[PDB]
Amino acid sequence: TYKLYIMTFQNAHFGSGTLDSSKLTFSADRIFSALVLEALKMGKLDAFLAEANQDKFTLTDAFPFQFGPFLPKPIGYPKHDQIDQSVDVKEVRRQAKLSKKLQFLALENVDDYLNGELFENEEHAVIDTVTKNQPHKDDNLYQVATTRFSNDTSLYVIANESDLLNELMSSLQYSGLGGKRSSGFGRFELDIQNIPLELSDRLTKNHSDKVMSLTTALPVDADLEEAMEDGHYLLTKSSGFAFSHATNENYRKQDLYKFASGSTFSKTFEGQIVDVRPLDFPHAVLNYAKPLFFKLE
RNA sequence: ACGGAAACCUUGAUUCUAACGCUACUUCUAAAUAA
């Protein structure tokens, strides 16, 4: 709600479920887990947990940043009320395919897209796969996909200006983010910027109008029905093997279905720092699904 | 408590075998006319 944390990447691998896949942007659960792990290994885990449990804490999904804050395509607003055209069906299907292919809009034209304007994607990163082997038994051949950014494209996240969070970010920029961090993939350089004046007035947490979630958030049971009864959304799985130092064997942490970004809702709701630890294991796994909204027209 | 942790695109392999810078060739020819 306060800052515009930008992070310049050169090579990163954010898995989509398999090691051979690599998404362009990471979700908020990945960065929250990275921060929690950094605080735990440094020693100040409880301070970060107390800050996260407070309602002032905020975190959003990674979004592209290329000479201007970019944002998620609003799911459910190509609405025909502003998309009615007299063109033939060939152009109608071409523009529908172009809209479906679009994944990230620029902040300068977000309202323009809500008016019915059409935009295209931009060169951000190339998803390349490199094959490596294990020459210790000479019977291994694995493949890792990466997301080497260029065109001076960085990633940005929106978090509060806090000394703890800034310190954890600065410690994380030499620890990498996601993937084979101790193999080259994941490293980044941190910078801290102020939110542009065209974003801070709309980046919100509470009104009753239509608000795009900017985070993979899961409402509590109190307002879930009201969320989906008049909402447009997408579902993502936060499954995986829970990285932990207190087991000799990896355990599949509990699957979780979360509302992606940008899911549009008729009102704001409350998130959850949900425990997804397997039964009978002292330290838990925290999945951050807490909303940061965007006010729309 | 990051679909994460551990993995060298590594092991050996001569741009190598054959092939005359070779063939014919005198550092040599002409002495007029005048006295």
Burial tier of A12 (Cβ tally within 10 Å: 0-12, 13-18, 19+) = buried
Resolution in A: 2.7
| CA–CA distance, A293 with A209 (Å, rounded to integer) | 11
Q: Which whole-number Å values give the CA distances from A189 to A22, A64, A125, in the listed order?
A: 20, 15, 17
Q: Which bases of chain B come closer than 7 Å to a protein CB?
A: 1-11
| CA–CA distance, A23 with A285 (Å, rounded to integer) | 22
SS percent in chain A: helix, strand, coil, step 5: 25, 25, 50
Q: Residues A280, A200: contact at Cβ < 8 Å?
A: no
Give the angle A29-A108-A153 at the CA atoms, nearest 5°. 55
| CA–CA distance, A187 with A45 (Å, rounded to integer) | 22
Give chain A residues 41-80 with Cβ within 7 A of strand B.
45
Would you call A225 helix, strand, or coil by DSSP? Answer: helix
Give chain A residues 187-246 with Cβ within 7 A of strand B.
237-245
Pairing of strands A264-265, A211-213: antiparallel
Structure obtained using: cryo-EM
